[PDB]
Design a protein around this ligand. Structure first.
Ligand code: PRO
Length: 97
């Protein structure tokens, strides 16, 4: 579960500037719900965002959602029902792209 490999397979990243980055992973047939596969604050959020760019993972800024995911959903956990709609919207955009 190395940082680069996690980002590489991620579906979408949601961010609050350089402070927080949340890497979400959803694949029908593999994940029953979107999974928080990687998270970072500060230097680590910066690392995530540069790797995202290198691997062409869509990065969407949403400050309240990035904040709330970071507070509530730890790396390696699925999202909770609170997040289903908002994260479903972010996944559809990533698919759009
Ligand atoms: O400090 C926080 O807000 C988050 C909670 C889970 C991991 N870090």
């Amino acid at each position: 579960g190395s940082l680069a490999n996690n980002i590489k397979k991620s579906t979408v990243i949601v961010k609050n500037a350089t402070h927080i980055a949340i890497c979400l992973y959803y694949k029908l047939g593999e994940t029953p719900l979107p999974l928080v596969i990687e998270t970072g604050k500060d230097a680590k959020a910066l690392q995530i965002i540069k790797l995202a760019e290198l691997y062409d993972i869509p990065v969407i800024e949403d400050i309240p959602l990035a904040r709330s995911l970071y507070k509530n959903i730890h790396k390696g956990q699925y999202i909770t029902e609170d997040f289903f709609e908002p994260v479903a919207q972010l996944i559809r955009i990533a698919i759009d792209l």
